[PDB]
Amino acid sequence: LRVQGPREVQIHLVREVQEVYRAQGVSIHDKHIEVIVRQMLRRVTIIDSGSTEFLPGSLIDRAEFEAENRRVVAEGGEPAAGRPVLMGITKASLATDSWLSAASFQETTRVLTDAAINCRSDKLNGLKENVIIGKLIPAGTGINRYRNIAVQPTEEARAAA
Amino acid sequence: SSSNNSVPGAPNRVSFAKLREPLEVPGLLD
Amino acid sequence: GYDTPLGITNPPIDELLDRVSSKYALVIYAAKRARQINDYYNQLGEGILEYVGPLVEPGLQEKPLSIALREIHADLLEHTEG
Amino acid sequence: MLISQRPTLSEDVLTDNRSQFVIEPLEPGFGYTLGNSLRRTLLSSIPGAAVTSIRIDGVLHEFTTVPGVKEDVTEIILNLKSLVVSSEEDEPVTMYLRKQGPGEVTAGDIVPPAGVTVHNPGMHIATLNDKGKLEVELVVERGRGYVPAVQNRASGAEIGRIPVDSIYSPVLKVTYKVDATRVEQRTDFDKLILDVETKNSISPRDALASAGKTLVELFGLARELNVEAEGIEIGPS
Amino acid sequence: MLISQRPTLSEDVLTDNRSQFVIEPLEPGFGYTLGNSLRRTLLSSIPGAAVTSIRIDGVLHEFTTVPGVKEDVTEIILNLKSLVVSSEEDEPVTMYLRKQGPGEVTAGDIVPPAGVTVHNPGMHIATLNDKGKLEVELVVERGRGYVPAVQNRASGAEIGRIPVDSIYSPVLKVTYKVDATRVEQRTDFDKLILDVETKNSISPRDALASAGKTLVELFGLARELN
């Protein structure tokens, strides 16, 4: 990743996992491994804190990084330096914005105490969290598009009745 | 020959055994 | 190009998905229509106000979901997304 | 003894001559016992009539083609073989089909003598071209079931006559199944679902009736050993 | 090719409880089917008699031992179940076996009333050494095929009653062998040879008659279209 960039490490990871699975005569379309790899390459490490409130060496998500840089440039520019980073699936799982999902995943004591120190608020926007609180998962037949369909007899069929 | 001679009331269960039996199975719960 | 569908597999699912875009859409379509049919059944003894009974002649005791799926197959209903 | 259910024979017509009979509550071993007997009796017990052999002028040794006719000999053979003909005379009667000049040869173009009747007058036997002529002599004898081609009994008797397979049975195809049909503390019974496909000669209803008659005769012969014996009776009506 | 000879059934008696019936001429391929129809009917639809339940003097349940018998009561049931009875009454009857003192106890000691008759005396029931008494009451009843243990509570009965599984099958074993005549003449036919072997409760002729009656009834129901 450091030498050849994110695309090269993506293709490398997909090729490696596919090699391992093909050796044992198992077919998995590459899009699943691609989803996982996309999830692994989500964040960027902060090299220069800059005017933005990013502690050096802290991995922040790409959306927040780009948005904060674009805000700072608009309001007293001092762009922050950021290197793409690769995270194992456990680090990515435990670095979620929801302390509830990370707590339920692993290391509940560490996640809960660090969340308590940082006073993190959990936007119940995930699937695991909506399952835990017992609300409709934001997926499948829970999307706002689908849970709010409007069924009604047509005027012709309504009159025919 | 047959099943065995050690047990008195052994049913006549003929055996395809070719090799003999130098020793008898010890007491199993011994 | 098929034999008469029997039971839970009737009506064909592709002819239903023709009326909608996604199986997720047909799920809520059938669910809401079944709720309305059940509301009509529970309101028939009470004052019938707005819950319209089934449109396609329901079977002997066809459960509301089956009737709703038949109605969607015959395309009596209409749905809109959100 | 007495059986409390008394299966019911119900028929569902599918084509003009094709049916799907459904019996019903059969004690939980009788779906096959009567099903396979009825299948084989429908196939080969019912009398019928079919072409046993034919002769075509101009073809004695070479069976590759008929001069003046587009179709080869084998196609003519298996087009005549599918000729629904019903006869009354027990003897093998002879039929002649002749046509000259270009045109189409059809089953209606064969003159049936008193007896044989062609139940499918419209059937593409052959075509003709270039002032072509066709003259084929048939022989029909009533039989039962399916009888493959019988080789010549006397080779010197006839050189042009050639034998063909004989589908005497008017029933073409029969298939059956069983299902479990009951909720009466016992979901174990049988339901025989026949599927009879017959020719224009006999409707599947009449073929099934004839098979029932045949099996009734056979099993009545079997039962004649002891008339006053204790057994299971379905009952009248 | 219209074979003009109707099937005719002739019987051969190999012994009292076995007989070979020959049926010919059948149309080709219709030998196996007819023979199997008769076999299926014989092996499942021949009425008969069997013991329904018992009661022994000094046993409340069926998992005890009568005093003085080498056979646990369960083995007594397993021995009784091999009885071969032939009843004529359409209602439950009762049979009693009484023995006291040394000596083997067999089915011959059973005293049936008028009608029912035990058809294999001498088989075995139990042995009494010096101080064993066996007074067992049987209940013969007519039936067909197989009927599991009739529950004691479902049908009002006493605590000492022991329901027994009843196998009413009078047929023991059946088979067939079809002799097919294939000839270039095409005057083909099939000769069936049915071997019915009954368990001495009814002669094979009676079982074959019952099977024939059942099949005649069914195919007569099938003969209601025209």
Place this chain on the structure above:
Amino acid sequence: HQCGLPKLMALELFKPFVMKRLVDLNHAQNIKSAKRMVERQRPQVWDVLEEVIAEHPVLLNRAPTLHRLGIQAFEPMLVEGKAIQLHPLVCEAFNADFDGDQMAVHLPLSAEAQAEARILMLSSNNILSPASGRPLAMPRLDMVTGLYYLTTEVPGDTGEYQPASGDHPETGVYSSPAEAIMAADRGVLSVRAKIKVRLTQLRPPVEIEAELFGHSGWQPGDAWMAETTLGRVMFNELLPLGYPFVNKQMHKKVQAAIINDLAERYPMIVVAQTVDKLKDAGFYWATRSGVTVSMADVLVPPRKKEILDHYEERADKVEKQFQRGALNHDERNEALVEIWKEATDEVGQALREHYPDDNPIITIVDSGATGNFTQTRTLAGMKGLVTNPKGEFIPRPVKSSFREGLTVLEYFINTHGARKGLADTALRTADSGYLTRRLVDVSQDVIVREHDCQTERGIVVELAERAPDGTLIRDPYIETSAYARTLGTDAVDEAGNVIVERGQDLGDPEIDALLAAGITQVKVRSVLTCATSTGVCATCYGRSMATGKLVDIGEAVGIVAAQSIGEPGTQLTMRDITGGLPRVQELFEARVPRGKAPIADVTGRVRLEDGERFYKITIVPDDGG
């Protein structure tokens, strides 16, 4: 779509429904009376229960639920007994055999819940594996054997077609399949004998239709002569009316091809009905295939002793050379291992040659039903080398098959390697569960959110690199890297027009056209490059493998990906460089592999020097640094 349910389990799951229906039918004045009736099981509770459970889906679940299809919804049918009756085709989906496996039953209640159970989760709608899209309701085992037997042409069989001999006309020609079946039921015809029938209900193949009908089509009812076997006519009579006639021996690959073609061309109901009919036919004809086992059916190679003595001479020579100090222990073991591997291969070749083509064991193996010829060799010829607890091969080796009966030592050294297999299987399923849990946690919030981000970023797929001499050899692993994608650009070859327009599913016709045009690389849309702020877009993800169409706007693709990658973990063996499940773990965790082999950092020549316990791989900076 159906499952058989014990009546005494249905009576309990559907208790409230039965109570309501009893009260409705005036069989119980109040709810308490109906509850008592259900408790005491009066003879009418069954009558109302069959009505109640009618068309009410029931989700059958088996643990472990490794993948999505571990939960499927069937239609309950009361069955006499105490065991759930599971349709044999969903066994592969559930990974369920019948050696004592149990399954859970779940009943959805709300009208929403039953809609999911009847549409989303019905078994007949779930025929393709979401991992790869291959069919999972495909016939297998007994069905494969039956269809393989039915669709076979054995030369010199009864009722076979014969040309004219100059004295009598052609023989073996039938006017219709009905006549052929009538002949077969009379014994005059064999269901596996080549015949010429006159078909009028089977659509002819492509070439025959083109060279006979042309015009527009075959217009069912039209007749055509087909030289085939009766069994193949029967088999093609189970495929849809419009399917072209398939005159082939139905190996498992052929049946898979048929099922997948139906799935990709026909509605799902047609595919479900077709697989049901094929199940019925295969079960019927496997009973009549006469496949049984006897030690007479397990034939032995004829000259096994000769081969074994021949290689024993080589072993003796190697042993004598070792005794004379010509080589150390490792070289001797390696030489003996090679010798005995060659011996086992030769014995396997001889055994393969010896068996007839109709031996039931070879029929079952070659039919694709189950097993391989390694097991056939182990049973008949010889087992070969066995592994030490360390892992090294025993140089003995095992020399007796399981038919002749292993001696005491051979059996012991075989158990040596068998126990390791069992234990590693247990430990690896334990590890794969954890890997699947971590994968499901990392990618639980990847959901299709937009129908199209309308981006232009994409990735390039190898797609059949060109041959050196000049030829377009298809890349072997294209089914898992190019299909079920959407193009990010257009395809133009040799200044030609666009072969495939942007935004195409890129299926079989598309890839065939691209290869015919003669272009090797194509840019396709991938989730790695989707521009949506939260979740992937539908076009970037591409076709949903399960449904066969474009993925929906609510699809939870992250969990599907995690399950698809983590379901075949048991299959993947746990076998210094890691090359199994540990390799997958240290990949997805990106820990530091096992041996961090250095990679180049800049172009240029290398001045490697060779030493012991180290090297001097120095790369000249061709860039100029």
Place this chain on the structure above:
Amino acid sequence: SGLTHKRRLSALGPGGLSRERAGLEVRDVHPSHYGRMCPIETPEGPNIGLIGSLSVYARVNPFGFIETPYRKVVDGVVSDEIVYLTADEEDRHVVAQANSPIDADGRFVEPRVLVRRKAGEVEYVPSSEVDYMDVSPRQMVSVATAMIPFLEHDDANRALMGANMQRQAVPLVRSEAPLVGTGMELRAAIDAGDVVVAEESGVIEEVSADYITVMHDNGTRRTYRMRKFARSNHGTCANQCPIVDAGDRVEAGQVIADGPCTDDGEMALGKNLLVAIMPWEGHNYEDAIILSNRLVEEDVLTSIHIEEHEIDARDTKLGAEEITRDIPNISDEVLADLDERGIVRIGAEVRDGDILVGKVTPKGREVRDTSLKVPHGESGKVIGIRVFSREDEDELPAGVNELVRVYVAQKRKISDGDKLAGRHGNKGVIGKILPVEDMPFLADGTPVDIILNTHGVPRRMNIGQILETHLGWCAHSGWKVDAAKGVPDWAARLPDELLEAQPNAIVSTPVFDGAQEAELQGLLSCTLPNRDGDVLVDADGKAMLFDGRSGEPFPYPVTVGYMYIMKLHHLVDDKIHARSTGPYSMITQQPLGGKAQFGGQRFGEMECWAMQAYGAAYTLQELLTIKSDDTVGRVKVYEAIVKGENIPEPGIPESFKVLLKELQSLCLNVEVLS
């Protein structure tokens, strides 16, 4: 099962390995295990290798190490004077396999005999190098693995499955010793302690179902009392029946009575059934089994089981607990069965829900009718009541007065779902019980009793079952090798008394020294006709069967024979279970777990992943909210279904509120903002 339990080597105890932590180097077969621990017969799950079994001939030295007998071979002479070597000394010398061809003259036939060299390296060697020898070709295996016939023809996995299955066969109401056993069945029963071996030689004087009375040869009488219809640790009957007559003379060490699984003193864990090896209409698909109805009507596989229900009346601080008949707020009809004391009369079929012991709770009227009742899924007659009274100065626990206990027994026939299995690992569940009419019957009309799929044998490398089937047919039919002009070549080394056997002749094939393949071929070539001069099974061993369902003979011959199969203790009656509503857990208001207290199946974490992957949101929501821990949701859902109203909306999982309270209790102000 008991005898194998008493000879187990569990490597996991306090001071031993831990199951979770144990690696893969311990869960293995070591070359030193030969003759001390069985390389087969290991638990099939997580205890794979941590629980072994002691071999047949092995014994423990004073220190604690195991020793295995050998047969000191001297100067190439295989001499007697067995010496019990240990593993360490075993390594030093070179052990010889007893199957090696000793020519009865103290000298091997060929010089090259395989031997475990030093570190378990099997190699050839000259007779001068050989130091010791095994005792029998059958020394490495255990007691339950030695009862598998044709063991060397099965693969290690299937032999392990069969060994672990012989310990699960339920005692059948009648017992039948195998026709094709091995020989380790008489000793496996006389050394297991269930057959009543006579103490001293004597003459039986009075033999009854409950007592034998051996009249010794010195005037002494020693009456053996038979434990009839007792309950084992696993609810299986423990019948013991005498197998001697009142006049017979018995010898010291003679078996005088049968046990639970025994036939004339030999282990009989199953029955001999006529088996076909054909696939049949898909009913025996993927390891399933098809049984004849004869096995149900004739009680061929009909096991007796007994359950033990107990209830006690504690003194308690309040006092006065009493087992009384009068049940407060009860009906008369339900109280009919109970005797005067309040205990059901023995011999009454107590169905599920019926009262067994009316017990009241005087919470010092404050008397709850907490009466022991036939638990969920119980039935059968009441065969025995045991009541221990404080007034009778009994040794009762502290603070009780009565410890009444009841036994309910039930005969379980074989049904669809039970798990019959042979000795070779060919386990399966009965898929269908066909009526005896529609069964593949031989030419003579005999219907086969069981049908086993063909696709299970060749794949699993347990061909030993097929050889067992062939030899079972040979034993059942009986044979007579015709030595009219010289004995056959294939029967030269066949023992005498095996050249001719009457029908139903039980044989034995020792585990590693039994019937070769040529001998099976020959004994199939020569077998007696059944009743008429017709041999139903040809030389190949395959009969010409008739399809009873359709009538037409099957196109090809089918392998038939007699295979010994055993009814495993995995009956379907104990596994079927369902719940609509019932007991709920207390702390978390989820339903309860287990078939005992009704209970509900667990919708695991990875069954939520499947539902999420399907996109089914409402089904998952309802399953996790209104079916488990939304109490108001649960009750309203029940009311909605019983009435006609739509299914209500969900609420909040009680589990989530429990988690919130626990998180607060830690010291974290978790809050649900809005």
Place this chain on the structure above:
RNA sequence: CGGAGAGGUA
């Protein structure tokens, strides 16, 4: 019905 341990099934 909460915990600990043991055994077992897939």
